[PDB]
Structures are given as structure tokens and as C-alpha cells.
Amino acid sequence: RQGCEARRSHEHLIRLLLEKGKCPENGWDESTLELFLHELAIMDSNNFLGNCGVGEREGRVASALVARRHYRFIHGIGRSGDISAVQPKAAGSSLLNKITNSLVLDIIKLAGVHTVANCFVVPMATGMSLTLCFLTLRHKRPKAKYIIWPRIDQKSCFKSMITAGFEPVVIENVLEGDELRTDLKAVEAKVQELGPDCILCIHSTTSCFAPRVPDRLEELAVICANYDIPHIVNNAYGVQSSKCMHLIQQGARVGRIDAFVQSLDKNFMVPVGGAIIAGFNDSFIQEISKMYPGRASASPSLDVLISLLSLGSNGYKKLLKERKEMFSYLSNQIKKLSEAYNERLLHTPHNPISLAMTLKTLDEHRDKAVTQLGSMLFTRQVSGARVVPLGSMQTVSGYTFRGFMSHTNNYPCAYLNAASAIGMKMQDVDLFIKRLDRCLKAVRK
Amino acid sequence: RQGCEARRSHEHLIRLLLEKGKCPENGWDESTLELFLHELAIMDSNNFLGNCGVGEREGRVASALVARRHYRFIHGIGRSGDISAVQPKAAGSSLLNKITNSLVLDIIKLAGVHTVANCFVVPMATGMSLTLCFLTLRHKRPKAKYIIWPRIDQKSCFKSMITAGFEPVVIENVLEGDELRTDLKAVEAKVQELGPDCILCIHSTTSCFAPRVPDRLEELAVICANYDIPHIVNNAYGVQSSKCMHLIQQGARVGRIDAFVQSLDKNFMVPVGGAIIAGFNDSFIQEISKMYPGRASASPSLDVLISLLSLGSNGYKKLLKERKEMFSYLSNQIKKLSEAYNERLLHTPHNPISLAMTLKTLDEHRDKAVTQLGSMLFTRQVSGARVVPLGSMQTVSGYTFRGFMSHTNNYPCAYLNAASAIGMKMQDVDLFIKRLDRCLKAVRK
Amino acid sequence: NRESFAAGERLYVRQGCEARRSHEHLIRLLLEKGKCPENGWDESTLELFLHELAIMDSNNFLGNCGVGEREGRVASALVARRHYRFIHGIGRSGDISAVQPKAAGSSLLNKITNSLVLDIIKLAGVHTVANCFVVPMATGMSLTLCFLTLRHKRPKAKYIIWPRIDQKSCFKSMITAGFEPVVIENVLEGDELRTDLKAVEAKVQELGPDCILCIHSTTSCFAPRVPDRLEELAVICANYDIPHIVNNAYGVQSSKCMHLIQQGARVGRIDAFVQSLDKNFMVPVGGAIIAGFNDSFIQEISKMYPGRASASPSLDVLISLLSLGSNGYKKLLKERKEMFSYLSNQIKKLSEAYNERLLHTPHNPISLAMTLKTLDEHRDKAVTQLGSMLFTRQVSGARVVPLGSMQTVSGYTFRGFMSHTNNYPCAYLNAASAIGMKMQDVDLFIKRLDRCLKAVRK
Amino acid sequence: NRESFAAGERLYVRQGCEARRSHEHLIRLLLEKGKCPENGWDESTLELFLHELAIMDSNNFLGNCGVGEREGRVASALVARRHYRFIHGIGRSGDISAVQPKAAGSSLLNKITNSLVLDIIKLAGVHTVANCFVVPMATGMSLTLCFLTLRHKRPKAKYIIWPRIDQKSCFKSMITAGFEPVVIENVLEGDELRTDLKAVEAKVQELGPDCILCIHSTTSCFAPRVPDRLEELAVICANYDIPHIVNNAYGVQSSKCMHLIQQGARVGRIDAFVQSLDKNFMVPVGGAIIAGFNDSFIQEISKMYPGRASASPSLDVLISLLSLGSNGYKKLLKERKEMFSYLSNQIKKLSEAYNERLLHTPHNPISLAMTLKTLDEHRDKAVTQLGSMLFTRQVSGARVVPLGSMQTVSGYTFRGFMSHTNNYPCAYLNAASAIGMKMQDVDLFIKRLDRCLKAVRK
RNA sequence: GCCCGGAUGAUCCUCAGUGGUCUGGGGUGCAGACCUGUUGUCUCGACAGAGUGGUUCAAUUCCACCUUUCGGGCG
Ligand SMILES: *Cc1c(COP(=O)(O)O)cnc(C)c1O
Ligand SMILES: *Cc1c(COP(=O)(O)O)cnc(C)c1O
Ligand SMILES: *Cc1c(COP(=O)(O)O)cnc(C)c1O
Ligand SMILES: *Cc1c(COP(=O)(O)O)cnc(C)c1O
């Protein structure tokens, strides 16, 4: 009786989640999290005790390892002709989906975009979620053939436009200092050259590898509002960046943003394979949702549910704070290391996540040193250290890129990337710095 | 030393899997399965001990519940511009993907289509996987606008064509007996009316609700070979059906089949959200693969890996045998129950999975009895008992269906569905029969 | 059942929340009658029930602060999760059976477990059992706890009368308790070794009832030995007023062993009978059950345990019996008999082909023996090298018993050890049908014995 | 380290397979030196290691057939998986420390665990410890096993000399073993109750050394009592040739308790010291450690255990120490001291505001007491109703000790029970800084005591 | 004057934090002696960013001025 009244303490955390839909401020104990998950899972028809199933999709599970690791959630999210709809044969999974979308909406606000109207989790990654946006827009703009796209050398967001069946119009960037930024003149020149009606959307990018910086979203959103063109923003890993989220918030204030897309793994530290589509026009975000054919995985949504309830909005905020500190620390360590090898930290103040160290002192043409550096870093187990040499030609779905991975035809120098992304620890920078040192010292030869 | 030599017995089951790529004949013990999974997971860079990560996608995991339930597989499958490629930052997950595709290829052979050339698992469900097929074909057939589609009242495969941005041409079916079958005359009439060049593909269906039966794939594949039109087959839940798989095997022998698509949950008893795309032209199946933008979830692939290694090809074969027996048993029980209520089992010999019992004795117009029946069955926890009344109009993405859910404008009677799908148990039929009885007896009023 | 609940829902989250009621009916039924379920619970009901219990324990409370030395803090999540967050053990430090106010959930787990185990003991053959409790010690230490309890009732006692069985744990259990085992040799009656009742009485008379702590008999054992004559020994004990403690280590699985305990208690005196958890319920090693017919004496043994004890063995058997259900357990019991028939018939066969025979031991319902008279050990050491041969080919629990093996256990020296007598006529091989044996087990055994015997032929 | 392995890979599945080598180095190091890792293992290394061990056990063999009665068959997958498929317990039935040939993996788990625990005992203060073993009984039964072992060495002994501490388990442990506790009252020296050494000797002399089984002293205890004077008692024991058994239930966490055991052993005689696993290592209740300085006597206690024992407590502490590492344990120890300072300073404060005081008990490094002289219990029963008040508001392990509580434990009647003397001057309240206490624990406690005291003011 | 029930969470239950999306803890129930001004991110019932005039992206009530005032100058 002291405990059956102490169970009330759990039930109250749970009631609070379902009533107001926001993140817990402080993370739930696992005991509460798992109790909740079990409460939901037994709401799905496949877990009923007196159930019989005479259909073709009944959520039957052949292996107990599979049923357990998914907390007995088998029916996925949505129904046949709506990914947004309650599934009567899975009441528990449907509530799971509603709660996750509502938590993620809360975190998108807390992270910067306070005026987001609606969003939903979609169990495909960011590139494919961008594609779903483009496929939704086709029906709205049946005459459109082109997507105007300020260049960023990332194969997934590029292919997303081609997979959707449109032609990307690659707008090269302008080099301002060390930074590569949006060529606003060319974007509007192209809008006028091709004609608004022939434009499906402008496709911009906020999170990206230095020396590129987040696109000028405010200006681009003004162009988009003026010419009545849809604006789609690739916010692949920018939820973690108050600067990135600011732009989106501001771009929607000054102008037009139809949807912005985010990755779950890059922003929430869960496995790869999910994304969020969010926007400001409520009915439109619903339209993208209703364009998804069939049911989908509940796995990315369960990971996000589990992570945000465990972290709480305080735990998430702490991760974001720690990311800013590690950026400075990484930045200062790159500064110090570079100076010793007569290189420098490229000046890229407008990129809040990514950094670049020059590699001018390595000769790729004669000693292949730049490429060797990337190998040595990889065999010495440094992960995510993107090395970028000059003059790489690369073909991606037909389109040829000169100076590929550098985001422009002729960047001044070869360089090396490093980033401070959510969840990085001091050990990461120190090991990176130490091992980059050993590598440089060795390429001197 | 007796055990360090008994560990060799595990390592040998594992070597055999990686060398020959086929299902174990008899299922692995869990001890072997989990040892293998752990061996692979520590091959991914995120699980290295001396690893440091300075990138934006590092497979960092915030919650231990999430990392454990995925056996520490965080990086998903594929790379940015290839879903088929080895991920150097995730060697273990990549091997996971190769092995799963190779096991699934083995099971597709064992199940009937012995001449399948290539296939791959894609972590989106069947509707969306069909869409990916259509999006791949667009580039091959830039003039095409129409998909010719023998009707089947299922919202997901229908929407798949619209989501891909094509217009479905709905070819009504011919009523032969109680069965609804392909109207081969109309399909060819439409090919000629519209013109082969304007046809993206013919989109046929094998697994479906009675009284529809599997499409005449051999004939359709001959039409497709003749007019040089792509043939895409929706095999949503037909892997479990030797008859269904026969057609595909025969259709490819006599004619043309470019790809056939299957659901993971309906055929392998794992959670919803994955599918297989398979075909006979090796390079084309690779082309569909390379059309996927970005990395994707490894979750559906891990479920399938876990299930097939636990079941073995013998365990899978047993499920298939048991499904045939339960079909007869269900069929005979429906026969007996119906007779008592002056109804009958619709004669649909060509449908190997689904059955239909007539509901002529229930008046939907005046007593709403048909609809009430579906409610009562649902509140009495009968799952998957599709009730189908006459004259339902329904709009799906703009297109209006008369007689929706009946697959034709005017079927003779209202009826009730039931199916024998993989994993069904005698208890399912007996509880279904018992509860359908109570329901009928009660609607008599 | 689900009908009246359906008629109600017929007058969509309502279907689900009212489907939690199904699980609750199963739980409400368990802890209001305390019997095993007829059919096993689904895992979802099982884990639901456990999760509810664990949050009843104070260490899992949400608004909790602990200022004590035993608060149930867990350093490793791997450790906390694998125990379903049950950390406080069973009992209070003054009473292993007392409700722990700091752990209401673990107390409830313990009571329920004892209740289920009582139910099984009844269903298994001893219908008149009065009381029992799970104790997280093996059978050997649980026998010791029985002897430790009897000392206080019989303070002049030094001796425990023990019909020989060559098993080091039950033998040492007497010495650990502080008493001196009086080993009564067995009588060869046919092929089987049985209780020498005259020698027991002769020894009761020589040493004196007041000097005897108890008679310590054994039901489950390895052929050719058979269960002790509990009815006769129960009458000796009743006449001379000597307590009777029965080692029933793996005889819950045998209705012949259990009906023999029930019968002994009907015509005479049995004070407690002790059973292993792992041998009878297929859980890990380390727990036992102490059961009896005098409710208060079983409570006295319980109250003699000093301190708190692990809840791990209680939780293993609670999960197993709820998953199996009484029907599931009965089936396991029915199959054990069937596999016992099959195993002997197969051993009759195999033995014939090697000029050996199945020793006639009908009174033993679990263990069989086959002669190895063919093999010479004095010359070419063929018998002692069949033991390791069977092991190498992974035949577990196949016991090879040579002639004239000498062995010292705690200072006492056995002759013909492993054979329960000093000169059994021949060398032999053991094999048994214990609960959970599958046909594959026997077929594999026969097959490898065949290859092993053929080999020895060199 | 990873450098020379990188230079090698520099002369893509090769990066991975050679990254299994990292885990192997950690494992190769563990079982070749047997020390704790300095830094905790990652879970992936931990679960890799365990999975490897478990398949070394015969029950997990792939080509296995079992024809025995103890084959380690598991009925429930929930049960098998939560124990990492470790089913065969520890030991052979004749020796709890013997390698089980049918369970090579569990044997290796047991040896390693004992080795790690030995390492911790050294790092914790008793650097001269010779040997120890984990035993799956709590501290109470483990004390009993110590007494059961001494009986065989001292067969005329009846008595155990015990400086009083009001805790029912260690007290009953003597009675369960079959001996009669001789309770030596404590001497009030200041605020704290300490060993009455004159009364101990007076009792050794009255009863006679040969009649004493051992002296049973206690280090960890609840204030105002403090650790026994082990050095003085170790000298008494050495002079009169009486074995000395120390109840160190939760004193591994205290370097003052441990350096006091090490010191007692330097100047005199300590035969064994027994520690709880859950109080010192934050694992579930139910295991203990028996340690000593004579290697052979510790082996004799081990060899007195009859049968096989649960491996569950060994596995809990193996997981915890490998996850914590020696650095992780040291940190927990350093933080316990810090929280002990903080807890008293906070209790000094709070007490002042209520006209109460922190009893001066510097010799006790774990437990504190605050007076409750304000509250009248003879009138308005205010003290006995603060106990339940603190409980209701979920203050666990806050002990309220009234005056004149009488209590009967196993027939012996204590006066002033819970206070360790028959008339302590005042009623008081206990609180302690035990390992794993977090600042939130203290702040919450002070806060609710404040509300509780304020309330009582009615 | 002038379980200048600074309950000024009806912007200096004052009368802590940032009806015209919060005039959590605890001067309870069921600048020129008065004056003037002052019902975080980016470089039956119905109608009327401030926890969540139900500047800036009908509810305090269910910057300028005016969980009024101060349980200073003149179990
Ligand atoms: C299973 C099913 C599908 C699959 O739809 P999804 O929900 O996307 O998996 C498509 N068509 C038919 C006929 C089906 O039965
Ligand atoms: C993360 C990333 C994407 C996402 O690609 P997916 O692999 O499909 O998730 C897209 N664009 C950029 C710049 C990215 O960094
Ligand atoms: C913990 C403790 C014991 C042992 O109690 P158990 O339940 O046997 O573990 C004995 N004495 C004291 C002082 C203790 O703190
Ligand atoms: C199992 C058994 C025991 C008990 O051995 P433990 O290791 O103590 O569990 C004792 N006697 C016999 C005959 C047994 O079979």
C-alpha cells in the first residue's frame, strides 16, 4: 500500500506526458520508461491475450529476440493509405507515434525554431525525406522541372533531387574570404532565366562541411516569397545548432520556408535511418505526410521516444551546451597544432559546427601526401576526419563536379575537416589532435 | 581446452554462413546467433575501443537501451551515394547487409523463384519500394506518363504509383465464376491505345484478397516482352505461396518481369517497415538500388537476419507447410459454418492465401447488418477479418472507386475475408470460427 | 469471458486500455489463490507482473533518498536490469520469511514463489505436504540447515544414521552441520542395492535414540541403488522418537519418489524432505526447497536462517512455473517417463550386442545401469578410459563406475566408491532420464556409446 | 599501442577483425594477472568476455547430449538469457573451489571473481590479506560457515565471545552454528560505545580458552557504537590461543575499518574477516566474502561448504568490478568520505536549529547519530512516531532509536535494543554515508527531517 | 504636494526565477519632501517568450504611462 501509492508516482509522469505532450524536463528513470513502453505495447492487437488473427498482416513474430528488442511493437506506424492515421489494429503503436512527433516538435522549438507548426518523424533518412518533399511538390506544381540548389558536395541531398525525378540546377557559391556562401545574384538570375513556373522549389542547406557555411536563408526565403516558389531546407544536422535553427526561424519570419528536413541520428544520437520533416504551413506538412504510401517502421520513432524521455529537455540542452564548448576547444586545438606545421585554421566564422585546417604544406601532386594523410588517419582509427584535396573530378548521377568535396571548382588549398557534433567528448579532440600530429610528423619525409 | 575446441563448433557454423551465403538448414542456437552479432558489431568503427570521432555522423548513442536493442549497430546500411556500398566506417554493418541479402536470395529460391538473379532488402515497406521502382524507371523511360494496373483495392500499392508521380491506368477485372481475374484484352487494348512509349510499366499483383486472384503473370509478361514495356510485380505477401512464386518464375520464363517486390513482415514475421526488391536482370536491380539516396536503417535487415538464422531453411519450410494445412482447415471450417447460416464459401481456387464467405443473408441497407458484423468481430478481438459491403464509393488520391474493397464496380454479394498466412495457428481458426458464429447468431435479430 | 467485455465495448483506445484487464485477471488470480496457472503465462504478462512488483520495492521509488548502509544501490545497469530491479533479497535480517517493509515487492515475490512451489509439490505426489520454503542454498547446505535446526531440539545428539549413497554433498552436509555420519551399508537384493533395515535398527539400539540427531534417507539416487524404504524407516523413527530427514534431491520429477514420501508420512514419521531447484525445475544451480508435514517445524527451520538471502533462485523458479504452468510441468513429467522407457529399451538393445545387460533395477524410476563386465580394467585399464572417451565425444552425465575405487571424503574412507557398496559384482555405466530430456538426447547417447565400445575393442 | 597496429595495417574488413584484438588484449590481461582493470571495461568487451566464458560450459555445447540428472537444462529463455547462460553454479559437489569439468567456463568465472575481489580487498586497506572466496550466502550465514569450520578444530567449545551489537543476523549466526553467544556489554566512553576489553578477558578467564570457539568482533556498525578494538582483541586471542572472527559486514568501503583489520593482524591474531557483497559493491543482496591471512584456514572454510552454489552473486560482482575498474571503485570510496563530511556538517546545522546535537563519535567512519532529546516518548510517544514519519516521506535507512526498547532474539532478551547498551543517555537518530551516496541523498534527507521535526511540534 | 483545497510563477495566498506559450519552493480550502519622468537567440448558462498602451513571430482576471506601495531629496 506504500508502493501501490508509489506506483502513482510513475503513472503521474506518464499522465503528464500524454496530457501536455512535452519532453520531461528531467529524464525518466528507466523503470518508468519501460513500464510505459509495456503499457503501450499491450495495447496493440497482436499482444492481446484472447486475440486471433486471420489476416495477412498480423504482426506475428517468429523470433523472440526480434519481439523483445522492439518491446513487442510490430505493426509499425500508420495505415495503408495514411502514415498519419491511427491504426485500429495497433492502438498502442499509434499513440507511440503521436507522442514521439509531439516530443520532437517540442525539441525543435527548444532548439531554436519556436514557430514550427507541425512536423512528423519519417523512417527514411534525410535524403529520401527530401525526395518525399519533392514528390509532394510535383502535384502542386505540375509544370516544374528544375530544383535550384546552391551547391554542396554531399551525394545524398544531390541525388535526392534526381531520385525525385527533377533536374538540379547547381548554383555555384561565391568565395568570401575563406568561406563559400550563397550566390544570391545567381539564384535570382536563374529564377528569372528559367521562369518561376518551371521551378519546383529552391533547395537550400544549413548544416554543412566547412568552408561552406549555412545558406543565406533569409534572403532566399524572400526570393521565394516574391516569385511564389517553394523553399525546401536541408537541415540535416542543424537541430543541434542554435545558429542554424535561427536562420530557419528568421527565414520564415522574413519570407517563405515550406519545409525543413532533419536527420534523427545526427541530431538525436540514435541509429541511422530516420528523419524529421517540419514546417510552418500546417496543412502542407500534412500533405507531405499523406503522400507516403503504406505503413512504415516504428523503429526510428521508438529510438527517439526512448532517447528524449531518458535525456529530458534538460539533458538535451546539456548536450547542446557541451557541443558549443567542444567547438571552441576543438577550434583552439586546431589553431595550436596547425601553427606548428605552418598551416592554419581556415577563417569560417559562419559555420557553427564544422572546421577546416589547411594542408598547404603537403604536396598531393608529387608525394600524394594529402591522400596518404587521410589513410593514416583512418588506420589510426580517427573517424570523420574528411581530407579534401584539390582538383577532384567526380560524377554523380551524370553530373560532373570539378573540385568535388570542396564545394567549388577551385578552392585555394587542400584542407582537413573536423566537427563538433552532439555527443563529442574531450577525449575525441585530444585523440584526434594527438593522432593528426603523429600523421603530419610522419608525412614529413 | 575442451571448450576452446568446442568454440570451434560455433566458428564453423559462422564460417559456413560467410563462405557459401546460404541459410543454415537447421536454425542456429541463440548462443551462436548472438556471438556472431557481437562479432560483427565490434567491427563497426563506433564500437572500436581506441576510436575517436570528429565527424557529424559517428553513430553516437545517447541511450543504452537503444544501443543494446540494436546489438550496437548504429551506422545503418550503405554510404551517402550508394545504399549498396561497403561503409568503411562500418565494416560490420556492411557485412550484415551482404549476408542478409544473400540469405533472402536463398529463401526466394527455396520458395519458388529459382531463377532470381539479384535482390536487396530496402528498409521501406512495399508501397514505397514499389515507388522506388517507378522512380528508377522514369529515367529509363523519360516519355512515360502512365502505369497500367489491373485493379486491386489496396490503398498502398495504388498510392505508390501516384507518389512516384505517374498516372495509374486502372484496368477493371473480368468476373469469371466467383473470381475476379485479369482482363488481358483490355490491358493490350490500353497499351495500343496509349502507345508503348507512353507506358512506364505494367504493374501487376499476385498476393491479394479473395475473390481477386493472382494476376495472369505469364500472359502479362508476354505482352510486356512484346511491346518492350517494363513489368513490375507486387508480390506483397506471396513469398509464402508456392503458387504465387510459381507465376513469377513462369512469367519470367515465358516473358518479361523486371522486378518483383515483397514485404518483410508479411513473409518473414518481423516488424513492419521493410521490403525486398528482386529481379532477373542483375544490372537493373542494381540500378534500383543505386537510385536510393543516402544511408538507410539496418533494423529491417537485422530482424531478417535474426529470423532466418534462427529458423533455418528447414524452419522456414515448416512454416510454409503449416500454412498450406491451415488453409485447408480454415477453408473446411468456413464451409461448415457458412452452410449453417445459408451462406457459402466463394469459389476462388486460384487464390492460395485468401478466402471469402458470403454475407447474402445480412441486409446492409435496412439493418446495416454487414457493417455491424465487422464491428462485433473487432470488439470480440478477431483481427484481420475484412468485411466487404456492396456499393462503397471511396476516393483515393483523387480517383474514385465504385464498389471499393470488392475490386470491381459490382460484385454479386457482400462477403467476409479470412486468410491463412504464415504463422497462423489452429487456435486462430477455431477462435475465429467460434466468434464469427456468435456474431452471426447475434445479428439475426 | 472476452464476450461480456465485448458486448460492453459495443454499447479505439478503449479496446486497448480494457485489454490491460486481461493481464490483470491473470495476476489477480495468481495472488489471491496462489496456485500455478494451468497454462503458462505469455511473456508480456510475466514481465508486466514482475515490473509491477519491482516498483513496489523502496529502492525503485522515484522520490527516494537513502541514508543507510543497505539501500539496494546498484552500480551496473547490466546487473540491475538482469534482476528485474529486484535488489533487496528476501526476508528481514531476523526472519527469512518476514515481509521486508523496505521491499514490499520482493516480499510478495517470495510468498508467491513459495506458494507455487507448494502447489507443484502437491501435484507431484506429496499431496499432504503442509509447508515449504525456497532457500537460496543448494540441497547439501539445505540439509545442513535442517541438521542445524535439530540440534537445538536434541542437544545430546552426535550421530546421524545414513544409508549409504556415494554423493559427496549430502554426505558432507552432515559433517558441516557438526555431526558424525553413521554409514549403514546397503543390502544387495538382486541387482539393486536397498536399505539394510536391520542394520539401521541395530545401530539405533547400539548408539541410543537420544544420541541420534536424525535418520537421513535418500530417495533419488543413481542405479543400482534405489530409493530408501521410507515407510519402514518412518516407522523406526516414530517408534524410537527420532526425527527423519529425507534427501529428495531430484525426486520431485518422480511420482514414485513422491508417493513414497507421502506414504512414509502416512504410516510413520518424516520431519522434512529437501529438494534441489535446478534438478527439478530446470533453473540454474543454487536453490532448494525444504518441505514438511509439521507446519511449525518447517517454520523453525526457516527462522533458523540468519539474515537476508538472495532472491535470485526464487525469481528463476517463479518465472519458470509461470511460463510452464501446471500443464506445462505435467507434460515435462509425462515425457520423462516416456523417455525412461525409451532409454532402457535402447540400452537393452545396445547392451545385448556387446554381451552386456541392463541391470534389473525396477525400483529406480530415474536412473539406469548397464554392465561393463566385458571390459577389463585390471588389464588394459579399459573401463576408466571409457569415462573420458564418452566425455570427449560430449556425453554429459554418463557415469562410469569401476570396481574397487577407494576414496576419502572428509576423513572417512569409502571402498568401492561411486558404487554404493564395497564390492558390487561388476563394473557398470549409468544413464538417466531426468526432466527435460529429449529423444535426441537418447539417440545421440546410444550412438556414441556404440562408437565408444567398438573403439575400446582394440 | 594502436600505433604499431596502424603502421601494420598501412603496409577494409582487416581494420575490423584486427580491432577484435583490442578486446582480446583486455581479456588476455585480466586472466593472466587477475587484477581489476584500472579503468572500467566497455560493455561490449564485458559482454564479449562473458559470452565466451558461457560457451565453455558443457551445457552450451552445440553437439551435446545429456543423460544425467544435473545437465543444466533451462526451461525458460528469460532465465537462461538473464544469467548469460551460466547454469552450472560454482564448484564440484565435493569442493566449492574445484574446477568443474562440466563447466570450465563457470569455473573460470569463479576464479577470476575471487581474484578481483582479492585485489579490491588489498586496495581497500588490508594489503596483507592472503586469501578469500566469494560465497553465495549473506554475511550472517557466512559467519555461520566460519563457526561451523572452527568446531572441528575446537571440539570442546561451546561459547562465542561477542561484543554487543544490536543486529539480528550476526547475533543469530552464532546460534545457527550451534554455539552459545556470550554477550559482552560495551563501555560508554564519551558519546560512543566501545569494546569493554576487561570484560572480554574476564570472560575468557571465567569460561576458559578451550571452551571458547572464537571471539566475534565487529568493525562496521551503527553509531554511537564504533568499531571494536581489533588490535587489543587480536592480542587477547593470540595470548590465549583463541581464534578471532571479524564481522566486517560493510567495512570494505572504509579504509579506517580495513586498516584496523590489517593492524589487528599485524600485532595479533585474526583468523577470518567476513564482508557483505551488496553493502560494499552495490549488487543485489545475497553474497559475501570470507577472507583471511592464513591461506590454509581460508581453504578449510571453503572446503567445508557442502555442494554446489549459485554463481549469481559471483557474476554480479564480476560485472560490477569490470565495469567500475579500480579507478571507478576508488572514486566511489573517495566520494563516500566527502559525503560523510557533508552529511555531518548538514546534521550539525539542522540539529542546532532544534536544540539537538551531533553525538561526538569520531571513531565511526560511516554512521552518524543526532540526539532526539527534545522529543518525549513516555508522553505523546513522539519518538516512535518519527520513525514512521520519515518512512512515509520515503527516507530509507534512517534509523530511529528510542530508549528502553526490549526485544527477544532467539530466546535471549535485549534491553535498550537498537542502542547497543541497556541505557544509553538519550534517544537518537541514525544516518550514514554508505558507498554510492549522492549529494541529492543528503539534501533530500535534511529537508525531510526538517519537515518531520517541525511537524512533530504539535 | 512636487490524497527621483525599487495562494505593485485582476514586465522595479510589496499589498523567487524568465474578464474590456511559463486601476518551480513553501515602498489554504473542497534622471530634473513634494512633484514629474523612469469583475534566450542572432552581429440552466453564455460572451468577454510574460509556467504549460483551454515593441515583437477580449485572460494578470475564467519599454512608456497610470513549478497602489516602499494549511531618497525638498503513517
Ligand atoms: C501488404 C500489402 C501492400 C504493402 O503495403 P505497405 O503497407 O506499404 O507495406 C501492398 N499491396 C498489398 C495488396 C498488400 O497486401
Ligand atoms: C547527413 C547529411 C545528409 C543525410 O543523408 P542521409 O545519408 O540520407 O541521411 C544530407 N545532406 C548532408 C549535408 C548531410 O550531412
Ligand atoms: C549487513 C549486516 C549483517 C549481515 O546481514 P545479512 O542479512 O546476513 O547480510 C550483519 N551484521 C551487521 C552489522 C550488518 O550490517
Ligand atoms: C543433487 C544431489 C545433492 C545435492 O548436491 P548440491 O551440490 O548440494 O546441490 C545431494 N545428493 C544427491 C544424491 C544429489 O543428486
Author numbering:
A (entry chain A), B (entry chain A): 19 to 463
C (entry chain B), D (entry chain B): 2 to 12, 17 to 463
Reproduce passages from the article.
O-phosphoseryl-tRNASec:selenocysteinyl-tRNASec synthase (SepSecS; SEPSECS) is an ubiquitously expressed enzyme that catalyzes the terminal reaction of selenocysteine synthesis. SepSecS converts the phosphoseryl (Sep) group into the selenocysteinyl (Sec) moiety in a mechanism that requires selenocysteine tRNA (tRNASec) and a pyridoxal-5-phosphate (PLP) cofactor. Previous structural work has shown that SepSecS is an obligate tetramer held by interactions between two homodimers. Recently, two research groups reported that four distinct mutations in human SEPSECS caused congenital cerebellar atrophy termed pontocerebellar hypoplasia type 2D (PCH2D).
